[PDB]
UniProtKB/Swiss-Prot annotation:
It is found in: Nucleus. Interacts with EHMT2. The gene is PRDM12. The chain holds residues 76 to 204 of 367 of the full protein. Belongs to the class V-like SAM-binding methyltransferase superfamily. Changing residue 77 to C: In HSAN8; no effect on nuclear localization; no effect on its interaction with EHMT2. This is PR domain zinc finger protein 12. It is linked to Neuropathy, hereditary sensory and autonomic, 8: A form of hereditary sensory and autonomic neuropathy, a genetically and clinically heterogeneous group of disorders characterized by degeneration of dorsal root and autonomic ganglion cells, and by sensory and/or autonomic abnormalities. HSAN8 patients manifest congenital insensitivity to pain resulting in ulceration to the fingers, tongue, lips, and other distal appendages. Some patients may also have decreased sweating and tear production. Not found in adult tissues except in dorsal root ganglia. Transcriptional regulator necessary for the development of nociceptive neurons, playing a key role in determining the nociceptive lineage from neural crest cell progenitors. Initiates neurogenesis and activates downstream pro-neuronal transcription factors, such as NEUROD1, BRN3A, and ISL1, specifically within nociceptive neurons, while repressing non-nociceptor cell fates. Essential for the proper function of nociceptors in adults, influencing both their excitability and their gene expression, thereby impacting how these neurons respond to various pain stimuli. Disulfide bonds: none annotated.
Amino acid sequence: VQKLSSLVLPAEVIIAQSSIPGEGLGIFSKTWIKAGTEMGPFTGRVIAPLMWEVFNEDGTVRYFIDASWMTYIKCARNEQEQNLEVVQIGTSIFYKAIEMIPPDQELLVWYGN
């Protein structure tokens, strides 16, 4: 698996106007992004129970991470336009490409499974 770090904007992506109605900027692929590519860690403030649940082993919510160039990736409104899934590694949040992503396609993230 390719690993894109959340520190500095990867060569594999650029920022341009989001194809989605409300939010202005978005992340667009610049090269092919292979299936399984993981991006992160997504960093932010830990909030007691842009924001993602960090889960316990039993599937309950432990806390929220509230916010990187990753903060420019907009949310998929539905599974059809989703091409990134939130994955938890330990208590860290990564985004993972569900499938191969073609060049010049907006990166849109949501919950998986």
